[PDB]
Design a protein around this nucleic acid. Structure first.
Ligand SMILES: Nc1ncnc2c1ncn2[C@@H]1O[C@H](COP(=O)(O)OP(=O)(O)O)[C@@H](O)[C@H]1O
Ligand SMILES: [Mg+2]
Ligand SMILES: [Zn+2]
Length: 685
RNA sequence: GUCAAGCCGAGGAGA
RNA sequence: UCUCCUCGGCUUGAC
């Protein structure tokens, strides 16, 4: 039933007899289909030889497992073989190693594999080896770089390859390694300023995958072009000539707080260097115990966030953001005040009497349809133009950086009627990150959105970086780029998603940022890498071989050194040689001896002395903890009945017993000293 | 069928 | 060395 194309045949041809190789063709050229044909050929070959053989497909995401368990492998190969798709959300029943030798055609998110490998290498948890396979197939090879996921697998593969080659000249017995087929669209250039460094990068990839060719289509090209096309590029620039009543109204507050602080930014309001200045200022102030300087740092950081979204989003969203923030703040203050406690503050009183007195005003200055936003009006024009031009023949995708962005966009495009009168149904899309003010999403919710859009029930999918790679849509036209430039790969992989006729690509930039600049940079890199590929394809085989062997050895030796600096590198097993203080206030909290651990992940104290100090701010089981001063400390945790209040070290501050170089660490794993697990013998009767 | 929390690794961007 | 964003994975719990 599965049908082929000609160029598919010629590009596949060498892989059909050994030849572990790489492929790169433009998006939507049957890469999956040619892979599927190679699967069928491989296994039929191994059976007609009466030999054993199995296949593992690797992706770098969680949708693609079921994407390709639904649409391309399973519908064609169900008859002759069993198939199974694995991800980070499919509740298995057996384990991974057992299904290595049960279903015979697997598909996996990557890290499942490496987990099982290092389990086989560390303990007796069953695990798996590479000799338990006959073929690895890869999608989106180009992530094979410095310390990525795929790279560890290929490091182990190359190590065993060199062992095989050392046994080539020492013994007869050697292990037959599995074949490797890599697929991509752009192997991509890793930050090279020239054509030659880019060539070197291609060779680094190819040696990190044990390649022999690339096999770009050149012969059967008319077939491609009559069958495949590209969109038309389009730039959309918009400049500001407004924002003096609102934006400057906030820069006013910034100057006011700085003149309350006596601290010079020495840079511009509304950027990242200003942020970094505030961050280091805060870290030093907490390293000094100085209040009045960390706190305006944190607030000015919030104002900078508000400005940076004001570069992208209306006044109203930032008003909402800081409304949530100071709402939480006043909640903490009232919770402290409402707990045999009488005291008042001077800083926080100043900040709040500075803000809330302008809260109503800024809400009044928020709602103004005149200067809503340049880029937003521009996309209104672009969108409505397209969705009027197509007459129900639309399928939309939108990209951006953050998620709060996406939520606001979906909300507001549900609000406005010019978008609803056309009936451009909308929904956003994100990866399962349980960290935001935003409400997170679920895997099943993601898949339902995929199905509703492929159904066409949604007309525009707002998507974060989960949606550059994959999402084999049947046919869509309109894709855009809301003020985002990362590299050449995101550009090309998004610019080729309109798998349909009369496709378009768009960028939406502000003139006050080097964005279209990097647009052109990525364009040049795209032109550059094809020339580099044409160079290496015409390379001599023996010279190619020598170079890839060099780079294999370089990758393996680099691992070893990165291992040498990580043998221990910090092994002071100093249990309680510290004191943890609060960070806002310089209030002592705990020592190291009262601390214990659960699950060898979570660090906690479980003594009444730490108990009778904090407050539980209400929304109910997982409660949030706060300080007496007003600092947030941690979250509750009900572990085996024990109501242990766990915390985050990033909120607290260090003070050693020896000489007190106060520091911040941002996470537990970084620091040297060790804490023990908690024997439950305590807290009994 | 629902929800919450924390931990870790990696990439990209910027400085 | 720092920051931001993003992604993938792992455990605990509650309905
Ligand atoms: N042999 C074939 N004949 C016709 N169309 C094909 C064939 N093989 C694949 N396709 C088309 O290719 C599309 C899949 O492209 P795909 O390779 O998944 O994109 P990407 O390369 O970005 O992963 C499908 O929509 C399908 O219609
Ligand atoms: Mg693909
Ligand atoms: Zn405190």
């Amino acid at each position: 039933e599965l049908q082929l194309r000609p160029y598919q045949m010629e590009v596949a041809q060498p892989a059909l007899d050994g030849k572990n190789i790489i492929i790169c063709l433009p998006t939507g050229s049957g890469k999956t289909r040619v892979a599927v044909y190679i699967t069928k050929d491989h296994l039929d070959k191994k059976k007609q030889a009466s030999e054993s053989g199995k296949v593992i497909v690797l992706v770098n995401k969680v949708m693609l497992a079921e994407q390709l368990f639904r649409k391309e492998f399973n519908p064609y190969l169900k008859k002759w073989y069993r198939i199974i798709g694995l991800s980070g959300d499919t509740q298995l029943k057996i384990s991974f190693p057992e299904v290595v030798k049960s279903y015979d055609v697997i598909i996996s998110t990557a890290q499942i594999l490496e987990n099982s490998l290092l389990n086989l290498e560390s303990g007796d948890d069953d695990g798996v080896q590479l000799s338990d396979f006959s073929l690895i197939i890869i999608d989106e090879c180009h992530h094979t770089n410095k310390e990525a996921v795929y790279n560890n697998i290929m490091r182990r593969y190359l190590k065993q390859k060199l062992r095989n080659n050392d046994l080539k000249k020492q013994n007869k017995p050697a292990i037959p390694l599995p074949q490797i087929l890599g697929l991509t669209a752009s192997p991509g250039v890793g930050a090279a300023k020239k054509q030659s460094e880019a060539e070197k990068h291609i060779l680094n990839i190819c040696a990190n995958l044990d390649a022999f060719t690339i096999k770009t289509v050149k012969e059967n090209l008319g077939q491609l072009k009559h069958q495949i096309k590209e969109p038309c590029k389009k730039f959309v620039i918009a400049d500001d000539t407004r924002e003096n009543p609102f934006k400057e109204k906030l820069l006013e507050i910034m100057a006011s707080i700085q003149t309350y602080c006596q601290k010079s930014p020495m840079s511009d309001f509304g950027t990242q260097h200003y942020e970094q200045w505030a961050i280091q200022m805060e870290k030093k102030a907490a390293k000094d115990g100085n209040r009045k300087d960390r706190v305006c740092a944190e607030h000015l950081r919030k104002y900078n966030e508000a400005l940076q979204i004001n570069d992208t989003i209306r006044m109203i969203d930032a008003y909402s953001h800081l409304e949530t923030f100071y709402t939480d703040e006043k909640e903490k203050k009232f919770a402290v005040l409402n707990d045999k406690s009488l005291k008042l503050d001077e800083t926080d009183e100043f900040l709040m009497n500075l803000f809330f007195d302008n809260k109503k005003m800024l809400k009044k200055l928020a709602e103004n349809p005149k200067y809503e936003n340049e880029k937003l009006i521009k996309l209104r024009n672009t969108i409505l133009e397209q969705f009027t031009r197509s007459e129900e023949s639309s399928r939309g995708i939108i990209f951006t950086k953050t998620r709060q962005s996406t939520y606001a966009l979906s909300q507001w495009i549900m609000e406005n009627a010019k978008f609803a009168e056309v009936g451009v149904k909308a929904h956003h899309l994100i990866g399962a990150g349980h960290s935001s003010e935003v409400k997170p999403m679920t895997q099943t919710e993601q898949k339902e959105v995929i199905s509703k859009f492929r159904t066409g029930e949604i007309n525009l999918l707002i998507a974060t970086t989960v949606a550059e790679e994959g999402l084999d849509i049947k046919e869509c036209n309109i894709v855009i780029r809301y003020g985002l430039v990362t590299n050449e790969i995101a550009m090309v992989q998004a610019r080729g998603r309109a798998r349909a006729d009369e496709s378009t690509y768009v960028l939406v930039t502000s003139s006050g940022s080097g964005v279209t600049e990097r647009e052109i940079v990525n364009d040049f890199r795209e032109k550059m890498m094809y020339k580099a590929i044409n160079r290496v394809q015409n390379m001599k085989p023996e010279e190619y071989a020598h170079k890839i062997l060099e780079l294999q050895v370089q990758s393996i030796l680099e691992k070893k050194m990165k291992v040498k600096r990580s043998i221990a590198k910090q092994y002071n097993d100093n249990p309680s040689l510290i004191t943890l203080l609060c960070k806002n206030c310089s209030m002592l909290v705990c020592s190291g001896e009262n601390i214990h651990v659960i699950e060898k992940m979570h660090h906690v104290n479980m003594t009444p002395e730490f108990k009778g100090l904090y407050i539980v701010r209400e929304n109910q089981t997982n409660g949030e903890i706060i300080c007496k001063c007003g600092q947030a400390w941690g979250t509750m945790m009900v572990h085996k009945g024990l109501d242990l209040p766990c915390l985050k070290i990033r909120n607290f501050v260090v003070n050693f017993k020896n000489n007190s170089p106060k520091k911040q660490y941002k996470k537990w794993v970084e620091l040297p000293i060790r804490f023990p697990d908690l024997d439950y013998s305590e807290y009994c009767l």
